[PDB]
Amino acid sequence: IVLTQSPASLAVSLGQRATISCRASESVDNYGISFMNWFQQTPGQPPKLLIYGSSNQGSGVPARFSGSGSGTDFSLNIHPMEEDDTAMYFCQQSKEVPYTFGGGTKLEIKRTVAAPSVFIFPPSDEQLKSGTASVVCLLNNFYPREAKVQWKVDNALQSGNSQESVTEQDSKDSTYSLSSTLTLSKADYEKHKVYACEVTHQGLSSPVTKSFNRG
Amino acid sequence: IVLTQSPASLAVSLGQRATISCRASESVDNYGISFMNWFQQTPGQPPKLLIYGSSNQGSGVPARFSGSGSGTDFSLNIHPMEEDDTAMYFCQQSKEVPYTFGGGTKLEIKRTVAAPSVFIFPPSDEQLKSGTASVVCLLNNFYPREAKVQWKVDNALQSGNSQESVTEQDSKDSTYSLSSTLTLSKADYEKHKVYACEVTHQGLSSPVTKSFNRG
Amino acid sequence: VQLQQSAAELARPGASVKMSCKASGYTFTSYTMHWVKQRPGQGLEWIGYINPTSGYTEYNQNFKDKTTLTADKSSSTAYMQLNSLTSEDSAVYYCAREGHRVGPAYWGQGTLVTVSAASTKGPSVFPLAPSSGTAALGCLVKDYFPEPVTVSWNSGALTSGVHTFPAVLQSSGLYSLSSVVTVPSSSLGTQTYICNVNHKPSNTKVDKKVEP
Amino acid sequence: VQLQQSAAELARPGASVKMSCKASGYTFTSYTMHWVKQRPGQGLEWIGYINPTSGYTEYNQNFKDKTTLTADKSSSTAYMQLNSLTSEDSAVYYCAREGHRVGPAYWGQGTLVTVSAASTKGPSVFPLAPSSGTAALGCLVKDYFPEPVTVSWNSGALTSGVHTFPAVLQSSGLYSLSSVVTVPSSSLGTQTYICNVNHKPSNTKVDKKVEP
Amino acid sequence: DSFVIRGDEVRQIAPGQTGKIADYNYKLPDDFTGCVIAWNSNNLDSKVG
């Protein structure tokens, strides 16, 4: 049985309905009861049972979480959205021996769109002494998660040379932070004059370019 | 797309696993299938298709050759390597319009490290009548290809005056042979007394000098 | 009902690892114990379940060959053995107890299995200096193994605006993370900024000054 | 599926050369035809492909200006023309039939195109007599153009221990190779050694004697 | 009906399954009051070479 988990990326503000919908290839219904189950995983924590069966709630589960559905279609709803609900929600089947979990829905709270603070870090001198160069493009306090970073080395797009690290949603700020590291050899780094970062985001009316010459 | 081919000069013993790796700047996968391709070129023969797609094998391809990988990373593995596998192996992409080939890996037979039979050869007298002097330093039956040849004219290092020719591996000996030719005018050859070639090889605990006085 | 697992086992490719799950709070002879696999930041794949009272093991098709499940009712401990470890096996394995007609019902913490050819290496820490409102600076930790590295500013004297991005495994098999902070432009002249990095596996405690 | 080409085209810089690849064993219209460049003993570069049914030609960005592709379905033959030849154009061009979702899939023998302003010249041979166990000797063939040279010893009477090394092109635009052998010291005086050099474009057949 | 499939794709012969075989080769209906019987034939189908 293959479980398809519609929307797996859901951003809803506090106090609003949030629906995660799991559809099964085959009927999970057997012996009359339903065997579709919902798990919650807080970052840094093991998965915890929320809904055993289609509707029955697990131990110590608030009334906010409600599971419904039958046959091949089920849904999990959290109307009184709270700060403690930011987690990863999985749908799982117990009808057949090979237990299959859903893709997983990452539920996060929503806030107003903010523009990214774009910063550029040239590599340190001692790094050039080590024969390596890493140039950093930084996006501070930007929402939503969607963001495009482009490295321009003397007006040339680079591909397969950048690594992006994104922090989780802040507990209070609720705004993301992104870092992009461009790694090159020292000889190759010293061969081009200008290094620029292109940031594309929903909060900007146009892509933002921040550049610096070598030295 | 730029394809980088790690190890591009591979020496492996018969019956041992041989792995040649191809890393792609962008994704080669499209429509679910993989477009990374592997070709074999025996010297003096046109390249022949070994692996079309990530894993599918070309026409008349023995089970020894295997392809694996996905996304940007692929590998060609030959575990039961046999004699006819000495060739140049290329990785190629079919995803985007300009088909790009990898650097290419020359697969070679491994054997025990052997010292080189070193010899020196003055230019012939009839060549001296022709106004040319070619001094030859010969290295016979040595492994591996790593060999530094330096010409000493009156204990002076020569550069930009020597041409080195490497033969292909012997079918049975599997040992390389090298010739280094130093070409000069007779006027320069007759103004110096002693000509030597110094050979540095991994199989020698010390550099080996072969010298001769003119005449 | 609480379950106790092993802690963060590292192995070379091709090796085997044995992992222990210690039941607590129940008979351990009335509930089948399940084992589940989870790659970091990925989905869940149920590996297989063992019945403690009668040693009946049932495995997922993918994990049938490389996984062995055993139980010990005397010490109330289940064991999972992974053989022929590869890079695809590095993950966060979970032990679970049967309950409420759900296969995995009561999970226990989580054990990190790391399969790699690398070795314990010390981090290299480089100052990301401010460029010549709010200015930005930081430190970059590159080529360390294994995780994690604790990074702070002035031994925890600065916490506002400090972003410690998660580490990323490079093609070389090592980890790197950038810890950055935004500071007032006026503070560049007088305020001194130092980054403190701690790597317990390499036992390195290194402090770097960052200045414009 | 067999492909045949023209062979060994020699041209001076600035000229244009046309190569023909004649198809066999297939419709010649169901599959496109690709042309690929390979310098001797180097990496391969794909030049461009043509659809025989409808004359659509796609070129690489490097070869778009200097390469022109044409097809003839009546004779089932693809023509490739290069203009403004330079030394960088000296290579072994290949024609390939598209198949197995590979651009170039079934390749052809190869057309060796050499760009040079030189002329066919006869080689000069100097026997490397042995220096005053086993001894070494040989012959040196210099200042010949173009390739190849057939080197034999005593009309094939000496096959063991022979090494004919690949030529190196000089700054003058000519080729030279040294053929060497290790021989017993007992045969240095009685047995004779003759090196036969054959240059068939210039038809130079020469015997040279080696004696210490 | 009968055919030969790859082992990893035997999972796709079932109602409501996705994959190359299910999407482009053999699509079972959602109702499908019937059985699927699959057995390995590595000895018979696979040949030398």
UniProtKB/Swiss-Prot annotation, chain E:
The gene is S. Changing K47T: In strain: Omicron/BQ.1.1. Changing V48P: In strain: Omicron/XBB.1.5, Omicron/EG.5.1. Residues 6-8 are annotated as: Integrin-binding motif. Changing G49S: In strain: Omicron/BA.1, Omicron/BA.2.75, Omicron/XBB.1.5, Omicron/EG.5.1. This is Spike protein S1. Changing N43K: In strain: Omicron/BA.1, Omicron/BA.2, Omicron/BA.2.12.1, Omicron/BA.2.75, Omicron/BA.4, Omicron/BA.5, Omicron/BQ.1.1, Omicron/XBB.1.5, Omicron/EG.5.1. It comes from the Viruses. Attaches the virion to the cell membrane by interacting with host receptor, initiating the infection. The major receptor is host ACE2. When S2/S2' has been cleaved, binding to the receptor triggers direct fusion at the cell membrane. When S2/S2' has not been cleaved, binding to the receptor results in internalization of the virus by endocytosis using host TFRC and GRM2 and leading to fusion of the virion membrane with the host endosomal membrane. Alternatively, may use NRP1/NRP2 and integrin as entry receptors. It comes from Severe acute respiratory syndrome coronavirus 2. Binds to host ACE2. RBD also interacts with the N-linked glycan on 'Asn-90' of ACE2. Cleavage of S generates a polybasic C-terminal sequence on S1 that binds to host Neuropilin-1 (NRP1) and Neuropilin-2 (NRP2) receptors. Interacts with host integrin alpha-5/beta-1 (ITGA5:ITGB1) and with ACE2 in complex with integrin alpha-5/beta-1 (ITGA5:ITGB1). May interact via cytoplasmic c-terminus with M protein. May interact (via N-terminus) with host bilirubin and biliverdin, thereby preventing antibody binding to the SARS-CoV-2 spike NTD via an allosteric mechanism.
